Nucleic acid binder design. Structure first.
Ligand SMILES: [K+]
Ligand SMILES: [K+]
Ligand SMILES: [Mg+2]
Ligand SMILES: [Mg+2]
Ligand SMILES: [Mg+2]
Ligand SMILES: [Mg+2]
Ligand SMILES: [Mg+2]
Ligand SMILES: [Mg+2]
Ligand SMILES: [Mg+2]
Ligand SMILES: [Mg+2]
Ligand SMILES: [Mg+2]
Ligand SMILES: [Mg+2]
Ligand SMILES: [Zn+2]
Lengths: 92, 96, 153, 159, 174
RNA sequence: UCCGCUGGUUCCUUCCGAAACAUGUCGCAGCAUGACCUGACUUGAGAUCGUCGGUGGAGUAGAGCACUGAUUGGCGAUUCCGGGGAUCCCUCGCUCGCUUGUCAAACUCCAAACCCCCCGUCAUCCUAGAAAGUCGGAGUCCGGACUGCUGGGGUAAGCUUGUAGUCCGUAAGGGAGACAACCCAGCCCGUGGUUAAGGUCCCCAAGUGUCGACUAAGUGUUAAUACUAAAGGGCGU
RNA sequence: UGGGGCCCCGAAAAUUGACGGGGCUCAAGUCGACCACCGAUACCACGGAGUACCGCAAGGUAAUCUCGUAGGAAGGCGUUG
RNA sequence: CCUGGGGCGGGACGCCCUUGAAAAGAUAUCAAGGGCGCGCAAUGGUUGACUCAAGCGGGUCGGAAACUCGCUGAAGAGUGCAAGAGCAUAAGUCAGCCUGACGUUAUUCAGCAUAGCAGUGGAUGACGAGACGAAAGUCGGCUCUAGCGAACUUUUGAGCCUCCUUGGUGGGGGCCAAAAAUGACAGAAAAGUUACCCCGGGGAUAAUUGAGUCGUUGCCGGCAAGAGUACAUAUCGACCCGGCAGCUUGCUACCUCGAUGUCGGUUCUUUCCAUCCUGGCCGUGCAGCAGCGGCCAAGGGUGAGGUUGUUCGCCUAUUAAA
RNA sequence: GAGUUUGGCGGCCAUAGCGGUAGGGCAACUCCUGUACCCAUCCCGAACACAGCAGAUAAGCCUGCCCGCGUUCCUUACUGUACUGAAGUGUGCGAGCCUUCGGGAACUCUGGAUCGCUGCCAAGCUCA
């Protein structure tokens, strides 16, 4: 499915309808200084690690298209609950 | 297997007679009920908005308020008192 | 005036028919009540037609039932002296005739019980597995309720 | 497979063939016998069943064959008119494991008939009334119900 | 064309082709009196109609025939007559006490500068509150009757007599 | 040790008295929450197990073919789409109608009886406390049966799985030979009386009862019944 | 010829056995009706016990109180100190 | 885990529609028909303008296959995809303008009747901004009901709060929302084998006997289609229809799992009759001999051997019959 | 002030629909006449829109009638039939069915009716 790259919608911050650009959200790398990373390193020893020796699960048949809507005026983005599509493109 | 949707077993409940299919009489959509009035719930299948559950079809509710276009009814369901919201298209005054 | 006498007991009866019996004050067999002829009581009696015998009662039968089985609070037996003290009628026959004519009420006897607990029928009844129209005792006896009421005195 | 299996009516109808799969075709070929373009037959006798039963298409075909043979032999090829009034609409099924998933497969069709319902009607001349009566008696021997013959038209023409 | 028991015949007003029940439903949900403006080929007519379970009730009514007593001799079936009838309807409704409504043109096409919108402008200019957008109104000159310049010299008197009828109609409700 | 699995768990009377069901659960021999039982308190005026009438919901039974599909011939036409041995020289299956014959869980032009909500009414209960609320204690989530629903499935089953009522479970006593649940009957103790169901030839209390017929087979002498043989035939009567 | 009642044929099982048994034939069977009687702890009457609620008490009311498994609630008996 | 034992098969293990379901509601099964784990910046919103399917007639190798005209046509079309429901001056088709397929938030329904239970989903509102439109209105996607997921964790968005005496930096912790999945779908990170097996229980649940049933099995009957050089019925007995027995195999799960000792044979006793012989009969397509068919009859008899554990069956030679 | 004709908006939504037949317009409506204009055609002033002197009741509309199909209501027969609530020591080998009291069709048939009824307003008119 296609969505326009730019369309006019509501900005929650400026509280008006402005043009907004849609940007796909990329998942970031997990920090090594978060409390869960420190806990994993602390629970690392001899033997089973508990939840830190779990193997990651499966995947749903289609993931949601993680989109972020940045207002062109205030340059602030907001993200809304998103649809679930096999193939996603931007309408240009 | 068998589902648990709202429209469960609604083939004839939410069906219209042959010569009442189409646009319903519009007078039923602009009727006003007073507080405490007894109204029947006779769902109009063509009006797909503001329709109470088909479980309350055939029940008489008491008007207890208004929530915009819709009316708030106190409708008895078994031994409980349920608050049912209905557009006047699905409602009908009781006649004494 | 209906005469309603219960002839079948309470085991294996639907709760709706049994509750109708209780609203007629017929909790036990051989118990009799007298109710007016309005459609409410008519439908109630039609509801319990398979457990009672009913019909129109005459003044003589009402007089005998009042004298032999009328009771007051504390289980006292109705008498003529109490009737003359608490009613404008001299005797019980005149009171029963007034009640049948509708110009008096059994509630016009102070402390009188609305239930008449009758004796079992002498020489038996026609049977509680058939209706009156089938040769049994159940159901509508019409004016012939007085025969059964006479044999239950 | 005896007719006593699918004989009693204990169930609802099973006739909507778009919700089922694979019904064997009926054995009964014709439903009108004799002279089909004649209506001025004065005597008209019919065979009525007297119990509520299901008649399989093979039983209907057997009864039709025997009655038609008797009529053609006695009254001639066009001395009678014979009508099989009922069509086998019910689908018979059988469970062919045990009682698990026991909903059966379709094995045939049957006609669900009511008491006093006409099965066969025969129209003949006055002189062939007893022959038609005899033929319908033989037809009823092939059916899973007790039957009786009744005269519908021309009762005064026989006695 | 009732073919049989399963045939559905429309409502009588729909069979006659005189009402749109979808539009009527949309207009009744206002719970406001409808300003019903209808026009025939020879004159224009305005009504104030409120709904009842027994049928519509009319509160006020102005027709083009009423203008002729105020000093109008032009055609009753053009823009000047429609505007004047709208003005009279609005003034009369204000006299009665009713002062609000919504425009009900029914099946009539919505065209800028139409007679319906001239009647609407006449209603607006009398103080009778009714929602609208000014871009659908006719130009003031053609409400005065500048189309008289088309073929007819006798029609050339329409502006001054339109002004005279307007002032008299104001005076009647002044 | 632990176990959701097995066995046991000790005095009396009195008041009340279930559930063998739903949802979730590595849940299915368990548990939680709720329904249902029990105790107490608060509150303070109604409630509805039943009737009758009325305003409403009906889409089941039955019925019917008007829709969706099936289904049987006859008759009339599609100079149309096509089966048979150069002017497609002429033969004709389906298709569409008017009559005939049949149907439907998942068809409906129709359409009950039950039933459900609400209003009034009578009736019953209720200030010796309605409806409502709060809190304490649970058991229970192996059920079974009869009578209906042609309940569904099944060749059927004292089969399996539903539903309404009522029972056994937990129900004595009376009666059916005996009989968990079939009939009378719900039962504090004692005495007297009269009945119920059922019975009255003896066993065995009460009829070798009455009237009118039938049966010749010891047929039968068997309400319900898991405890009772059919189609077919008989110038038996 | 048709419609009916009862009976007969159709009708074969394993220890000796089942209308409950004896037996029964214008019946002691079946059908249609009827009469009288017997027969419960039901119902009625009397007397008694308990219970619920009310009542300062005395006592009053109970046709609408008296079966009961799981189980809740109340009051008592007993053992040793 | 469910399961007409278990296992194999399957998923009735999450969601949605029709029937079952008995005209309120509820209602089970490895009940029946099934479907869904999506697709779509248009296949969405609004306004305007139109009306669909299919027939009939007219129109040039534009064929009874195109496109166009007229008539009929409440829908026999279309509306993305199951089923059911809804819709015609439209909820359909085309076109103009658009992005409401909007941020925040409250209730009540229904999943989960009555009657507690979650993530959710769906109706009605509020706040704030808009699109279309004269306005009324409509729009919280695609007519309504499927297309989905807790806690913890990470990452992302906006602005804030906070980190142990105080201020600052780097790095952490938190609040609200979005994304990533647990389909055994109210969420364990999870392969077998045991006949070497053990323990606790269960007739709550199977192998076996018993009970029920009788599809199947064995044995019959009704009607007689016909065959029988003719002749249904000496003999055979089609199609369909109705049974009996419980001696085959199934079905079922009522009894028994704190054990009712398996198959076959042997020994000994007994019963049934649907009779193989022996006795008595009837028919014959019965000359006699001997058959074939049937009826009565259960007193007596019904044996010996080869193979095979066999039951059963085959074979051998006797025999009144074996 | 009562009624009528016409017009507008409606209610119930076929008793109103489909079809046939005969009458009317003085006002009103309408068909109808044009396209300077506002507004319009995926082309077309056909529509919509505007401006309208004539012609016309042939249409729409109105009034009368017709039972022809459709619908709705009544009537007679079917029939108190089908079905069904309650109860039953009534009954069947069985699938089942019956009796009593209470409810009660559908279809078809005989004969009729039904070719809308109706609310608000306005305007022409017909008055004592
Ligand atoms: K049809
Ligand atoms: K099994
Ligand atoms: Mg437990
Ligand atoms: Mg039916
Ligand atoms: Mg019982
Ligand atoms: Mg127990
Ligand atoms: Mg009990
Ligand atoms: Mg007992
Ligand atoms: Mg106890
Ligand atoms: Mg398992
Ligand atoms: Mg080894
Ligand atoms: Mg062990
Ligand atoms: Zn912004």
């Amino acid at each position: 499915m296609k969505i326009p790259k730019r369309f006019r919608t509501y900005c929650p911050f400026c509280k008006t309808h402005n043009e907004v650009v849609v940007e796909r959200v990329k998942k970031g790398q997990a920090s090594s200084m978060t409390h869960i990373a420190r806990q994993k390193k602390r629970q690392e020893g001899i033997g089973n690690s508990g939840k830190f020796s779990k193997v990651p699960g499966g995947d749903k048949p289609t993931k949601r298209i993680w989109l972020r809507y940045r207002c062109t005026v205030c340059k602030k983005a907001h993200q809304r609950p998103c649809f679930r599509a096999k193939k996603f493109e931007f309408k240009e | 297997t068998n589902s648990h949707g709202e429209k469960r077993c609604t083939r004839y409940k939410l069906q219209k007679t042959v010569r009442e299919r189409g646009i319903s009489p519009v007078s039923r959509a602009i009727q006003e009920f007073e507080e405490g009035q007894m109204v029947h719930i006779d769902i109009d299948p063509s009006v797909q908005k503001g329709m109470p559950n088909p479980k309350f079809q055939g029940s008489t509710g008491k008007v207890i308020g208004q929530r915009g276009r819709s009316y708030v009814l106190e409708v008895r369901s078994g031994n409980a008192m349920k608050e049912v919201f209905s557009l006047p298209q699905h409602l009908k005054p009781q006649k004494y | 005036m209906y005469a309603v006498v219960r002839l079948r007991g309470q085991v294996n009866v639907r709760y709706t028919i049994e509750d109708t019996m209780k609203m007629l004050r017929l909790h036990k067999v051989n118990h009799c009540v007298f109710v007016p002829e309005n459609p409410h009581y008519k439908g109630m009696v039609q509801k319990v037609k398979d457990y009672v015998a009913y019909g129109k009662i005459d003044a003589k039968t009402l007089a005998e039932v009042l004298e032999n089985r009328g009771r007051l609070e504390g289980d006292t037996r109705l008498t003529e002296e109490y009737i003359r003290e608490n009613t404008d009628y001299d005797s019980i026959q005149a009171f029963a005739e007034a009640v049948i004519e509708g110009k008096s009420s059994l509630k016009d006897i102070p402390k009188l019980k609305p239930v008449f607990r009758l004796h079992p029928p002498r020489k038996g009844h026609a049977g509680i597995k058939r209706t009156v129209q089938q040769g049994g005792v159940l159901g509508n006896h019409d004016e012939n309720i007085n025969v059964l009421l006479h044999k239950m005195r | 497979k005896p007719g006593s299996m699918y004989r009693n009516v204990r169930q609802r109808s099973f006739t909507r063939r778009k919700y089922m799969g694979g019904v064997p075709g009926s054995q009964v070929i014709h439903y009108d016998m004799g002279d089909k373009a004649n209506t001025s037959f004065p005597v008209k006798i019919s065979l009525i069943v007297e119990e509520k039963c299901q008649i399989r298409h093979t039983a209907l075909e057997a009864a039709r064959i025997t009655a038609n043979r008797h009529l053609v032999a006695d009254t001639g090829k066009m001395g009678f008119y014979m009508k099989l009034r009922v069509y086998p609409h019910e689908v018979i099924r059988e469970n062919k494991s045990g009682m698990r998933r026991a909903f059966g497969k379709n094995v045939g069709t049957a006609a669900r008939v009511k008491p006093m319902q006409k099965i066969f009607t025969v129209a003949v001349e006055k002189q062939n009334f007893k022959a038609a009566k005899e033929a319908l008696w033989h037809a009823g021997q092939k059916l899973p119900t007790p039957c009786r013959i009744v005269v519908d038209e021309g009762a005064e023409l026989v006695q | 064309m009732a073919t049989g028991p399963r045939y559905k015949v429309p409502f009588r007003r729909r069979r006659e082709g005189r009402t749109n029940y979808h539009l009527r439903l949309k207009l009744l949900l206002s719970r406001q009196d409808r300003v019903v403006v209808r026009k025939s080929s020879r004159n224009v007519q305005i009504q104030l109609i409120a709904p009842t379970p027994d049928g519509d009730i009319t509160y006020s009514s102005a027709v083009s025939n009423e203008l002729a007593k105020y000093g109008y001799t032009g055609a009753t079936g053009n823009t000047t007559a429609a505007y004047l009838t709208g003005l009279l309807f609005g003034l009369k409704s204000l006299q009665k006490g009713y002062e609000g409504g919504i425009l009900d043109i029914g099946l009539q096409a919505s065209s800028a500068g139409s007679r319906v919108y001239a009647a609407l402008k006449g209603v607006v200019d009398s103080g009778f509150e009714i929602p609208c957008s000014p871009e659908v109104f006719p130009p003031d000159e053609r409400i005065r009757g500048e189309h008289i310049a088309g073929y007819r010299e006798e029609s050339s008197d329409l502006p001054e007599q339109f002004e005279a009828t307007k002032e008299k109609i104001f005076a009647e409700f002044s």
